[PDB]
């Protein structure tokens, strides 16, 4: 009942690498994933794969828990962890079959990890010029939106560029929470735009198109028949007693909307449905009524202006209301939306509205937009850029093998295997593009031998050659490559450190 | 029903006949081409023979199936017709059956497939014969020198390709003789390739004549002779015997002595009749007596002893002389004057290192020569001799048959475009028969691309992209006669590379493969007893 007992901890992580190796790159394949609520979904993002695939082996859960740390401090390269650290554990199995101990590979990996953190600042070619221009920003964002939505990057690189420039004067406060995404059904991606302030997809149900009131109250309860918090035994016998309750319901709701006018609040948000007679009372006292059925659309407004959602039927409470500058309506893309604009304030809220005919298609654009904001959320720190497309993966594999050859002793075996694990990432890019991977690696090492740096893969099915990444405009993030190498090495050293797994009762 | 076996009919015998025939094509799929892979031929005894030649594969392949037994006989119709081509018939006809098997499932009767294949075959010979090349360009214009240089690249001789390709080009054009009504062919016998140690491989010389690897022995006899008479004989001038197994009886001791004095006296009589003819070139297989060599250094006859028998058959064919087996003419002893003698011009004993050779010049009818492969050791000389023999047969088999065709995938790629446009001109339930005939011819570059370690979807499609432009517009910017260089993995022109194939190996391959695909497609019922 025991065969190897050290190989089964690695084979569980090799299956986790295979679910994202073919899904790597701009030529990567999509995944037909099934939601837990029985919903069909088509995506190719690496973070949405692990969220739905409930992996159960705890040896492969270390790389998944490393992906949750990969989502922190950087929003770039979750697929880089599942490919590179998967190639670390696959190449480490060739050393253990010879007779090498597992503790010798551990100290040899941490030696080559600190050596790879010194060669990576030497490969920084360009940097951002901090001009806050749409030509400088969209030139670097065109590589990050690639490998998410290929072919439609010409419309996505300009829209997120117009959102992040409006936040860059607010220095030290740029984040992904300031740029929100609201999806509106429409024609396609060509009709999409970008707006300022908080934009919701639902229009104002009332007849007010513009109001300058600051007091905003949110009530999650729908507009229906009022129920007393006490017992409240209400009995009806005849038709005249039913009309006394029907007219008395409208008369009490007339005093309910009058309490909103007494506190000086002309903006009300209702989570549930609104009755037709209660909608007439809101338009009488010039009150803007916006219906928001989504709970995440209601929770977004409490964390911005402070207006809380109360369960009671319109309570006149002055303490739990929010504050905004100007709430109005705007007609963009043949659809009226509500804008929570900040006129007196300088403003740091931007909303990118996305249009599309398929909800399964518009959700993949939302993961491509939030990964585009997270590329420049990293660039609020020290600006360093590295060439992409497998350009840095060969030069880092060239210097480590040159370093491990000159170093004598038993530690030269784990350093040489640390460089060949970087070769799997151009092997993942060449295989997904329909090109023989053994020819591109030989074409990459032949041009890097002569000193022609910044050379990556030519993205073409018919051309197995290479091209320059500096003239092509392909650039990655150095901090995106810095935390990816450190977290994948710390994850792959954790799986090799654990030998056997024993179940225990609580 | 009570019969003497099992009966099976319908389309299930059509699908079983094409699966048994295409499985034989997989036996000769990887072995196609000059880079073909070896395959193990397991015998019933237990030993195995490693052969890569496809003609020897189908001879030893024994599959007890009647569908596979049909493809066994076409190997006998291929060597008896031309002598080459064999496995190219098998891959074409099996892919012809596999595409026709898809037509049976597509509600097409095979009668339209059989009549459509014969019209597709006859139009294939018409498009080939309209795009041929006459056997010419022997001197002055290269598609030759470069033709034999590709065959010479696999060995160590390919470092200096231009030096050794000139030795085989002028040797092929030297052995040309019509001999029947203006045929000219090339014989199975060729130049004799000798070797020596001439301190490097660059000291090879193109000798315009046969060179004998024998040493004349004595030095007092002169090595330069002017007379033309050449004598060849097989009987020994040494002491003769009756038989190796039958002997004569000798009883008296003095009787033994007088037959040795008679042997010394009858050697004086035979040398009087040989030198009376004036023949100085004396070549003897059985050896020359020691006192008989004394008479040759004073008369000036160039006597060579211990000559090989197979070397003397090319010498007597050179000067037109007759080989004399016995000197006794059934009652006495004569030399057969003016019968066993030829004519020549000059025989020089050239000083070659480690083997002083005998060269003959301007004989009666020889047309042969010799190449002295001077080198450094026996390793580089033995590998260069088989490289000259392999480069000789490449230029020989091309320049025989009276016209040639640029082959190596250039024939079938051009036929895949013309026969498709011809298929759209006929109709009448045979368009799909000719359109699948064009796609079935594409397996010849398809198996050649997978054996050349290249992408088969790119290398075959690069052949059809160039051959389509020859049919669209007749402008010279269209690449014409584009062959397939399997070494570099890039298509080139066959006229510049010199890759040529005979027409009779290309015509009879398309003729035999369609007649073999017709016979298997006509099988609709199986009867066993």
């Amino acid at each position: 009942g025991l065969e190897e007992a050290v190989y089964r901890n690695i084979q569980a992580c090799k299956e986790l690498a295979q679910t994202t190796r073919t899904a790597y790159g701009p030529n990567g394949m999509n995944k037909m994933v099934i939601n837990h609520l029985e919903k069909l979904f088509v995506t190719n993002d690496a973070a949405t794969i692990l969220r739905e695939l409930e992996v159960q082996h705890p040896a492969a859960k270390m790389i998944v828990m490393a992906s949750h740390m990969q989502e922190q401090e950087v929003g770039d390269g979750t697929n880089f962890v599942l490919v590179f650290a998967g190639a670390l554990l696959e190449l480490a199995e060739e050393l253990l079959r010879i007779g090498l101990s597992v503790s010798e590979v551990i100290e040899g990996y941490e030696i080559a990890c600190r050596k790879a953190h010194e060669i990576l600042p030497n490969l920084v070619c360009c940097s951002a010029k901090n001009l806050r221009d749409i030509d400088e920003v969209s030139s670097l964002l065109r590589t990050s939106i690639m490998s998410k939505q290929y072919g439609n990057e010409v419309f996505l690189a300009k829209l997120i560029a117009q959102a992040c420039v409006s936040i860059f004067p607010d220095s030290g406060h740029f984040n992904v929470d300031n740029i929100r995404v609201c999806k509106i059904l429409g024609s396609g991606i060509s009709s999409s735009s970008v707006l300022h302030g908080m934009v919701f997809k639902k229009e104002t149900e009332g007849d007010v198109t513009s109001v300058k009131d600051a007091k905003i109250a949110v009530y999650s309860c729908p507009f229906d028949g009022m129920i007393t918090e006490t017992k409240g035994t209400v009995l009806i016998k005849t038709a005249e007693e039913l009309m006394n309750f029907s007219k008395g319901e409208e008369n009490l709701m007339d005093a309910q909307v009058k309490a909103i006018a007494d506190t000086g609040a002309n903006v009300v948000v209702t989570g549930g449905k609104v009755a037709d007679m209660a909608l007439h009372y809101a338009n009488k006292y010039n009150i803007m009524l916006v219906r928001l059925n989504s709970k995440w659309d209601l929770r977004r407004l409490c964390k911005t202006v402070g207006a809380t959602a109360l369960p009671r039927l319109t309570p006149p409470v002055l303490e739990e209301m929010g504050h905004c500058d100007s709430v109005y309506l705007s007609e963009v893309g043949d659809t009226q939306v509500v804008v929570f604009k900040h006129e007196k304030e300088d403003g740091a809220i931007s909303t990118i509205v996305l249009r599309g005919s398929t909800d399964n298609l518009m959700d993949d654009i939302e993961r491509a937009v939030d990964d585009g904001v997270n590329t420049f959320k990293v660039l609020t720190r020290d600006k360093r850029l590295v060439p992409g497309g497998g350009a840095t993966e060969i030069e880092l594999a060239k210097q480590i093998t040159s370093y491990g050859e000159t170093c004598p002793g038993l530690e030269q075996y784990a350093i040489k295997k640390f460089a060949e694990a970087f070769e799997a990432i151009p092997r993942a890019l060449a295989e997904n593009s329909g090109v023989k991977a053994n020819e591109v690696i030989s074409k990459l090492y032949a041009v890097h031998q002569e000193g022609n740096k910044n050379v990556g893969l030519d993205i073409e099915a018919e051309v197995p050659a290479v091209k320059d990444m500096l003239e092509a405009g392909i650039l990655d993030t150095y901090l995106g490559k810095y935390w990816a190498i450190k977290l994948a090495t710390n994850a792959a050293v954790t799986v090799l450190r654990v030998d056997q797994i024993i179940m225990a009762k609580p | 029903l009570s019969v003497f076996g099992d009966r099976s009919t319908g389309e299930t015998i059509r699908s079983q006949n094409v699966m048994a025939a295409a499985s034989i094509a997989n036996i000769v799929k990887s072995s196609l081409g000059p880079v073909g892979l070896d395959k193990m031929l397991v015998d019933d005894i237990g030993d195995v023979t490693i052969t890569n030649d496809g003609a020897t594969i189908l001879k030893l392949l024994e599959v007890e199936h009647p569908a596979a037994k049909v493809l066994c006989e076409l190997a006998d119709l291929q060597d008896k017709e031309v002598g080459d081509g064999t496995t190219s018939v098998v891959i074409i006809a099996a892919e012809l059956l596999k595409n026709a098997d898809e037509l049976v499932k597509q509600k097409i009767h095979p009668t339209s497939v059989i009549s459509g294949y014969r019209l597709a075959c006859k139009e294939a010979v018409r498009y080939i014969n309209e795009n041929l090349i006459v056997n010419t360009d022997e001197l002055g214009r290269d598609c030759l020198i470069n033709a034999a240089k590709t065959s010479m690249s696999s060995k160590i001789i390919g470092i200096n390709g231009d030096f050794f390709a000139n030795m085989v080009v002028d040797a092929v054009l030297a052995i040309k003789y019509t001999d029947i009504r203006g045929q000219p062919r090339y014989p199975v016998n060729s130049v004799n390739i000798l070797k020596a140690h001439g301190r490097s491989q660059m000291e090879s010389m193109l000798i315009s004549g046969y060179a004998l690897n024998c040493v004349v022995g004595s030095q007092g006899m002169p090595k330069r002779i002017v007379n033309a008479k050449i004598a060849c004989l097989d009987f020994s001038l040494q002491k003769t015997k009756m038989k190796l197994g039958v002997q004569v009886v000798i009883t008296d001791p003095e009787k033994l002595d007088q037959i040795r004095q008679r042997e010394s006296d009858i050697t004086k009589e035979r040398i009087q009749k040989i030198l009376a003819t004036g023949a100085n070139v004396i070549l003897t297989t059985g050896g020359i007596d020691d006192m008989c060599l004394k008479y040759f250094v004073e008369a000036g006859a160039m006597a060579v002893r211990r000559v090989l028998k197979r070397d003397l058959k090319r010498i007597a064919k050179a000067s037109g002389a007759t080989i004399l087996s016995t000197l006794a003419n059934l009652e006495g002893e004569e030399t057969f004057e003016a019968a066993m003698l030829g004519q020549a011009e000059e025989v020089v004993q050239e000083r070659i290192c480690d083997d002083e050779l005998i060269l003959i010049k301007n004989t009666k009818a020889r047309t042969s020569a010799s190449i002295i492969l001077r080198g450094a050791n026996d390793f580089m000389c033995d590998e260069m001799e088989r490289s000259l023999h392999d480069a000789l047969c490449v230029v020989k088999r091309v320049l025989e048959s009276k016209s040639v065709v640029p082959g190596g995938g250039a024939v079938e790629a051009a036929l895949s475009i013309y026969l498709e446009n011809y298929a759209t001109s006929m109709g009448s339930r045979e368009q799909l028969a000719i359109a699948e005939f064009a796609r079935s011819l594409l397996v010849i570059p398809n198996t050649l691309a997978v054996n050349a370690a290249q992408d088969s979807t790119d290398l075959v499609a690069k052949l059809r992209a160039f051959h389509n432009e020859a049919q669209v517009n007749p402008e010279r910017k269209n690449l014409k006669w584009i062959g397939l260089d399997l070494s570099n993995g890039k298509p080139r022109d066959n006229k510049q590379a010199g890759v040529f194939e005979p027409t009779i190996v290309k015509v009879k391959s398309l003729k035999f493969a369609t007649e073999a695909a017709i016979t298997i497609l006509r099988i609709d019922d199986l009867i066993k007893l």
């Binding site: 073919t22 099934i34 099915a461 018919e462 | 498709e420 009448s428 979807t457 499609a461």
Partner: protein, 509 residues
């Protein structure tokens, strides 16, 4: 399963969706019987009707359903054209998958061959507006004639061709299929099919009220109700049980004043005619005959749904809410005797965008065969006035694209040659299935059609009437170019969503 065999499991689930709508291609296609869980049978030849009722459980098969779900909402039909075209794109590249070709190379050549299909169609599409100096009324009479050809009304096909071109003229620029109604009543000859400019119903109201109720009205107030005005009604009754014998007179009188006060609110609103889904009793038709009011009950709700849109009113269940805000208006209100039955209809509405076409005949199969051809003939003459740049139907544009994508494939080296060359044979499913669904010989027609396209035939297609080939551009069988573009781009996009999928992830639930 990731790689090659996951694509084979998705390429076999594509066949079971195409086979459900393979035989329904063409007007003479075979019908399908789909039975739900309740036990009702549904016979339809429409491809959108079958795919809505299948509800397939396979995840790779749900992609081709949702593409046809987007097609019926925008274009209107042609769900079997985008299904067989997207299916045949996969069956040609299926032997290329096992060879080792990457599925991204299938994507890169599908985006190229689709863009060549758009440029070839727009260069070959001819705008037919006033060709050969003909009237536009005669052009729709010829194109609707081929839709009714080889049918049961071929004896009077010239009369039925004039009926479709008159119904499309009475509407505005906003043309739709659901605005036209088709009624099926039994009796009469075949040539007695009249036309109604507005909404008409069968009018099964056979209660009392004769020698009154004038059928002529200039501007009446159309009342739309759902109330019952019967004496033995289920909602208007009174049952009071007592011993008092003078109260016995009161319970019969107060039961009458319940119906009388509900009838008094009708005349107080000023409604000239009243309509109701529930039947109307004889004492309510007697009350309207005394006050000179028209009444006609027992009308269907679907006939009322086309009436409230045209008259400009709305349906109100109760009689208390009857006022001038919900009363409809019209200009012509007459009464006919078509087929011996009474027929009420309105003509000259301010929102007159709906009509009704009554059919006559001696057999019900002579009527249901026509209404399948009538709805197709309506959408043909709707597409003719909408899109002027049209091409020949019947597989004529598919055989021309198979010629253009074949010789261009031989000019492109690489992996795109053997794929786009297979893309040309994948477009042959439209003229091939037109022969097998019509019962012809698919071998002799397609071999004659491809031989005609090489000699110069650019508008020849498959004739569904005869077993011949004919120029469908000259035979007035047309299809718009923009629908053929939208059917080709949706077929390659649906074929892309099956090829690009490489692994299926199922959450454990």
């Amino acid at each position: 399963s990731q790689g090659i065999p996951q694509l084979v499991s998705n390429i076999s689930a594509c066949q079971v969706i195409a086979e459900a709508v393979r035989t329904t291609l063409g007007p003479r296609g075979m019908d399908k019987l789909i039975v739900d869980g309740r036990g009702k049978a549904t016979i339809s030849n429409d491809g959108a009707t079958i795919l809505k009722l299948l509800d397939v459980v396979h995840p790779a098969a749900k992609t081709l359903v949702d593409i046809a779900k987007s097609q019926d909402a925008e274009v209107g039909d042609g769900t079997t054209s985008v299904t067989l075209l997207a299916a045949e794109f996969l069956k040609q590249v299926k032997p290329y998958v096992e060879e080792g070709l990457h599925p991204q190379i299938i994507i890169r050549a599908f985006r190229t061959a689709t863009q060549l299909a758009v440029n070839k169609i727009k260069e070959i599409a001819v705008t037919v507006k006033k060709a050969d100096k003909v009237e536009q009324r005669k052009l729709l009479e010829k194109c609707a004639m081929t839709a009714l050809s080889s049918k049961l009304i071929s004896q009077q096909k010239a009369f039925f061709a004039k009926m479709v071109v008159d119904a499309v003229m009475m509407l505005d620029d906003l043309l739709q299929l659901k605005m036209i109604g088709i009624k099926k009543v039994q009796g009469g000859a075949l040539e007695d099919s009249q036309l109604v400019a507005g909404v008409a119903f069968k009018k099964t109201f056979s209660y009392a009220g004769f020698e009154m109720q004038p059928k002529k009205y200039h501007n009446p107030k159309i009342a739309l109700l759902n109330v019952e005005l019967e004496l033995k009604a289920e909602k208007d009754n009174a049952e009071i049980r007592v011993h008092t014998v003078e109260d016995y007179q009161a319970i019969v009188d107060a039961e009458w004043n319940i119906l009388y006060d509900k009838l008094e609110k009708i005349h107080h609103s000023g409604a000239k005619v009243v309509s109701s889904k529930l039947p109307i009793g004889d004492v309510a038709t007697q009350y309207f005959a005394d006050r000179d009011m028209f009444c006609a009950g027992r009308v269907p709700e679907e006939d009322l749904k086309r009436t409230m849109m045209a008259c400009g009113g709305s349906i109100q269940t109760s009689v208390n809410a009857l006022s001038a805000d919900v009363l409809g208006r019209c200009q012509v209100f007459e009464e006919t005797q078509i087929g011996g039955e009474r027929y009420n209809f309105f003509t000259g509405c301010p929102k007159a965008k709906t009509c009704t076409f009554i059919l006559r005949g001696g057999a019900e199969q002579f009527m249901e065969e026509t209404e399948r051809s009538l709805h197709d003939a309506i959408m043909i003459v709707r597409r003719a006035i909408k899109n002027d740049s049209v091409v020949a139907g019947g597989g004529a544009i598919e055989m021309e694209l198979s010629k253009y994508l074949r010789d261009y494939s031989r000019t492109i080296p690489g992996k795109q040659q053997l794929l786009i060359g297979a893309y040309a044979k994948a477009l042959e499913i439209i003229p091939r299935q037109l022969c097998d669904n019509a019962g012809f010989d698919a071998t002799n027609i397609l071999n004659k059609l491809r031989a005609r396209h090489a000699q110069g035939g650019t508008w020849y297609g498959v004739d569904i009437n005869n077993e011949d080939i004919a120029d469908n551009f000259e035979a007035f069988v047309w299809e718009p170019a923009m629908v053929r573009i939208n059917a080709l781009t949706a077929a390659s996009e649906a074929a892309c969503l099956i090829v690009s999928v490489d692994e299926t992830i199922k959450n454990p639930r």
